[PDB]
Amino acid sequence: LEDSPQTRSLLGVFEEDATAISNYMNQLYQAMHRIYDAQNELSAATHLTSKLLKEYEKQEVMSSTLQQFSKVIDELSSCHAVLSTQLADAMMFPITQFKERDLKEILTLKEVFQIASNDHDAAINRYSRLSKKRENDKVKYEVTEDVYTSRKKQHQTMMHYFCALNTLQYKKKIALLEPLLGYMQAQISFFKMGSENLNEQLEEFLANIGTSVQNVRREMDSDIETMQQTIEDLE
Amino acid sequence: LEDSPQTRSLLGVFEEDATAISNYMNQLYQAMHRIYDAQNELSAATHLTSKLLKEYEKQEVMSSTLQQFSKVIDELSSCHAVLSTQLADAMMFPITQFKERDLKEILTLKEVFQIASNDHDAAINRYSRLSKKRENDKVKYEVTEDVYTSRKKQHQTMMHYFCALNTLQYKKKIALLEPLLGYMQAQISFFKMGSENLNEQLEEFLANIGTSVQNVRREMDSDIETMQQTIEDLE
């Protein structure tokens, strides 16, 4: 990449690609952010539900059954809370930093280059203006010098910008794969830990509660017939 | 429960207890509803993220890596979606019906009793009014008959109300245990199915992506030194 024409040409392609990269990563940032918010809210609601079950007693066999449910639910809420903090740290942080630091840096340097470029166009236009007239040896030297200094400035800001565009090609891949790896690793711990808490003893408990429920339903139907009898007698 | 005084007394206790039951179940309804909404949003955001990863190609080795992530994520989004529909059906439905049908029925019957009671007070007051004066054999018979019919009406609405208060004692237990059992059963399938999708081959894939990421980081650092050299030459 020997000269300015070629580099400027390649800069345009890197810039168009950086625009597509920004559009896709912003969409990914938004989707992941919805996952993060939902998992955070799900942890809080699951912990609130376990908290409420404990508060039942603050109005006894039911009390105790609710305590066991509350204990299992609190274990699952811990899984959800650890997953939330790992999603924030290993998934949200990387995609957020790519958007807030890298993509912003690209726009900033693009603008610094735009201004240095406007400044050089002004010097070239002023050179054209002063070329059309008989004038000072001094202003001639100055207008020429301004072309050189404004072009050097334009070139330097262009390369600062092109270097970041080139590095963006790498950050793009890292910022795509890092949050996905972080997300997946956190899910593996969450499903494994949760799944172990949900054992065969817990299933025995659930089967028995199921039976307790069917029994209450039967007793209800039977006591409704007594109460209807009691109503007729009182009438 | 031989007579009206006793029954009315016991009705007051059932009514106070129904008020405490409504306050607690409404709080439980609200907590569970937050769990339901969060799990629904989490399923949609997880499926949207897998959808976006597939769309990457619609701008190749990255393409393929993103496809594998998208496949694993779509499997987890299926777990989340089945859990959502089971939470709606086995947890939200029972606590919702207890609140929208049972608790509402209690308030309705309580009001029907309140009006029948106001009507009897009016007949008793009218009996007092007509007792203080020399008047018709007919109005006397009528005002007496109105006391009897308004009291019978008051008593019947009272018993309709007391029977529902008594049955509420059973529904209360069923509506507490049913959603909790439904919730827990759905969680067991979700963690088991999810956990199996997250196997040792998937862990091999993740370890290799981790390596791919560290390699991109190295290549980046190295290509940045080349680009800085290229910049100096172009200047």
UniProtKB/Swiss-Prot annotation, chains A, B:
Coiled-coil ranges (or none): 195-235
Tissues showing expression: High levels in heart, ovary, pancreas and skeletal muscle.
Residue ranges annotated for the BAR domain, each copy included: 1-235
Subcellular location as annotated: Early endosome membrane; Nucleus; Cytoplasm; Endosome
Listed result of changing residue 74 to N: In MODY14; no effect on protein abundance; loss of function in insulin receptor signaling pathway
Function: Multifunctional adapter protein that binds to various membrane receptors, nuclear factors and signaling proteins to regulate many processes, such as cell proliferation, immune response, endosomal trafficking and cell metabolism. Regulates signaling pathway leading to cell proliferation through interaction with RAB5A and subunits of the NuRD/MeCP1 complex. Functions as a positive regulator of innate immune response via activation of AKT1 signaling pathway by forming a complex with APPL1 and PIK3R1. Inhibits Fc-gamma receptor-mediated phagocytosis through PI3K/Akt signaling in macrophages.
Disease: Maturity-onset diabetes of the young 14: A form of diabetes that is characterized by an autosomal dominant mode of inheritance, onset in childhood or early adulthood (usually before 25 years of age), a primary defect in insulin secretion and frequent insulin-independence at the beginning of the disease.
Oligomer status and interactors: Homodimer. Binds RAB5A/Rab5 through an N-terminal domain. This interaction is essential for its recruitment to endosomal membranes as well as its role in cell proliferation. Binds DCC and the catalytic domain of the inactive form of AKT2 through its PID domain. Binds PIK3CA and subunits of the NuRD/MeCP1 complex. Interacts with OCRL and INPP5B. Interacts with NTRK2. Interacts with APPL2; interaction is independent of follicle stimulating hormone stimulation; interaction is decreased by adiponectin in a time-dependent manner. Forms a complex with APPL2 and RUVBL2.
Comment on protein domains: Overexpression of an N-terminal domain (residues 1-319) or a C-terminal region (residues 273-709) has a proapoptotic effect.
Protein name: DCC-interacting protein 13-alpha
Organism: Homo sapiens (Human)
Taxonomic lineage: Eukaryota, Metazoa, Chordata, Craniata, Vertebrata
Residues of the full protein shown: 13 to 255 of 709
